[PDB]
Symmetry: D2
Subunit: 149 residues, 4 copies
C-alpha cells in the first residue's frame, strides 16, 4: 500500500463507486458529455510510459473528447465543474453536469456539459493529480482525485 | 526546503498575502466573524506540542470563536465556506464571507459569517490539513491549505 | 511526474543503470544468485492488482528464487546485503554479492549470495518501498529503492 | 497526526530513547565527539525560520562542533557513520562511534569520532532529511532520520 492524499468526492451519492488508483501522472483524458458528463476514462503515465486506465463508459449518445496533455511539461493546474440533478434522469440524485480542466501552460479544456447547479473548484498550488476516484451509474455521478508531489 | 501538497486560494486577490506553513497538525483555530470573516489565527501541532501560528487579525469588531479540536484523535475532514464581493468596503475584490469546518468525529463548526456568494468545498477523503495559506487586508480576503499524510 | 523519496544507490559504479519506477507496493521478487546476486526482477502491486516489472536478468547459471509476499498484510521491513568486487569477474568494480529481505511478519528471505565485503542496511520504521532502482551489467551491480507512505 | 517516512535505527538498543520530530529542514547540527559520538543537537528550519531542536547532550568531555549548513540551498545528501560496542563503558551494547555528513554542495563534515565497528551509509538520491530519531544514554547510542520531499 502506498496511498495518496485523496481529496474529493464531488457530486451524487448514487451510481456505482469506483477508483482508478494512483499512478505517476496524467497523460490524457477521454469523456463523453452533452447536458452533463457521461463517460469518463483516462490515460495515466506510469514511469514515463502510458498506461490505459479502467474504463467508465456511458451508453448515452454523448459527445466524445480526447484531452491530449503536453505531458510531462504540462499537467493539470485545476479541476472545476458543476454538479446537480438531471432533467433527463429517472433518479433525482445529482451528477457531474459540467467539468473543466485547466493546465499549467494556460491551456483550458471545456467546460464540458452544463455549467448548472453547485460549482466546485480545486485550485492546486503545489502537487499533481495522479489519480481519479468517482461514481458512474448511467453517467458520471461523482468524481474526486488523488495527489502527490 | 521540504514542501507540501498545497491546494487552495479560495477567495479574492486583494488584501495582503501570507502563508503560515506546514506543521504536524491542527490543534485549534481562532477567528472573528460577522457578515464576513475577519481575524483568523490557529494553533498547529508540532510533533506533539502546541505551536502558536502567526496572527492574521482584523481590526473590525467581529464576534470571536475558539475552535478547539480534540487532537490528535480529531482533525478536519472538510472545509466549506463562501466568497465574493462585499458592501461596507471600498475595495470591490472578493473575500471569505463564511467558513464551515466539519470534523472526522462528526462535529461541525459554523457556518461562520454570511453565506453570501460562491460556495467552495474541500472534502478530504484521505489526508490531513497541516497549514494555512491565505490573504488578509482589513479582514480575511482568501484562504488556502497545506496537506500531507 | 509524482516522485518518491529515493534513497539508495548501493554497490558498483559499473554495469548499466536502470530504474523500475515507483508503484503501489511489493508483491513478489525474483532473482538469481550464487556467489553474488545475478538476475533481479520484481512483481509490484499496482492498486490491488499485480504488475510485472521490467526484467533485469543475468545469463549466469545462478540459483533462481521467487519471494512470495503475503501482500498486502506483509511488506518489506528492511533490506540488507553486501557489496564488493568479484573473483569471477573481469572488471574490478564492486557488485551486489548478497541481499537479505526482511518482512514485517518476521519472515526473512536470504541472505542470498555471499555475505562478503561492505555491509549495507536500510531499516524502515515508517513507509514502504514501492520501487527499485539499480545497475546490472552481467549481474546486479548496484541497487536502491523508492518509498512512500 | 501527519507522519513521515522514517528510515533508521542505526546503532545500539541501549541508552534512553528520543525523537526530535519532523520539521521543514535542517539548518545546523551541533555535536561532541572523541572516540565516539556523544552530544547531538540540531537546529531545524520551520517554514523559513530557525527552530532549536531538543537537546541530546552527553556529560563526557568531547570536542564540540557546529555544522552550519548553507540552507536552503544546501542540505544533506548522505549520512555515513560507525556503530559497535565500546570500551570505557560498563554497558556492552553498541553505539554511534562515528558520523559523516556529505552535502549536495559537495562539502563533507567529519568523519567525527573513531571509525570503529560496522559502517552504515544512507545515500539520498531524491529527498530531504527533516528529522532525527535516536537513543542517548551517557552518550549517543543510536540515530535514525525522518524524510520527506
Ligand atoms: O425515481 C423513481 C424511482 O427511481 C428508481 O427506480 C428505477 C426507475 O424506475 C428506472 O430507472 C431507470 C434509469 O433511469 C435513468 O436512466 C437513470 O435515473 C438511471 O439511474 C442510474 O444512473 C444515475 C446516473 O448515472 C445514477 O444516479 C443512478 O443511481 C443509476 O446508476 C436509472 O437506472 O428503472 C429502474 C429499474 O431497475 C428502477 O430501479 C428507484 O429509486 C425508485 O425507488 C424510485 O421510485
Ligand atoms: O579488467 C580488464 C579490462 O576490463 C575491461 O575490458 C573488458 C574485458 O577485457 C572483457 O570483459 C568481459 C566481461 O567479463 C566479466 O564477465 C565481467 O567483468 C563483465 O563486466 C560486466 O559486468 C559487470 C557486473 O555486472 C559490470 O561491473 C561491468 O561494468 C560489465 O557490465 C565483462 O564485460 O571483455 C570486454 C569486451 O568488450 C572488455 O570490455 C576494460 O575495463 C579494460 O579497460 C580493462 O583493462
Ligand atoms: O487609503 C487607501 C484607501 O483608503 C480607503 O479604502 C479603505 C478601507 O476601506 C475598506 O475597509 C476596504 O476596502 C479596505 O481594503 C483593504 O482590505 C481588503 C480586504 O481585507 C483588501 O481587499 C484591500 O486590498 C485592503 O487591504 C480599505 O483599506 C479608501 O479611501 C480608498 O479609496 C483608498 O484607496
Ligand atoms: O548505576 C547503574 C550502573 O552504574 C554503572 O554503569 C555506569 C555508566 O557506565 C558507562 O559510562 C556506561 O555503561 C553508562 O551507560 C549508559 O549509557 C550508555 C550509552 O549512552 C547506554 O547504553 C546505557 O543504557 C546507559 O544509558 C553507565 O551509566 C555500573 O556500576 C553499572 O554496573 C550499573 O548498572
Amino acid at each position: 500500500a502506498s496511498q495518496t492524499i485523496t481529496v474529493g468526492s464531488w457530486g451524487g451519492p448514487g451510481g456505482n463507486g469506483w477508483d482508478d488508483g494512483s499512478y505517476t501522472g496524467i497523460r490524457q483524458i477521454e469523456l463523453s458529455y452533452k447536458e452533463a458528463i457521461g463517460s469518463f476514462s483516462v490515460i495515466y503515465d506510469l514511469n514515463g510510459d502510458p498506461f490505459s486506465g479502467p474504463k467508465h463508459t456511458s451508453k448515452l449518445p454523448y459527445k466524445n473528447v480526447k484531452i491530449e496533455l503536453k505531458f510531462p511539461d504540462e499537467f493539470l493546474e485545476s479541476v472545476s465543474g458543476y454538479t446537480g440533478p438531471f432533467s433527463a434522469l429517472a433518479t433525482p440524485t445529482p451528477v457531474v453536469r459540467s467539468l473543466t480542466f485547466k493546465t499549467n501552460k494556460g491551456r483550458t479544456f471545456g467546460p464540458y456539459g452544463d455549467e448548472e447547479g453547485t460549482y466546485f473548484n480545486l485550485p492546486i498550488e503545489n502537487g499533481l493529480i495522479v489519480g481519479f476516484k468517482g461514481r458512474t451509474g448511467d453517467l458520471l455521478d461523482a468524481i474526486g482525485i488523488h495527489m502527490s508531489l
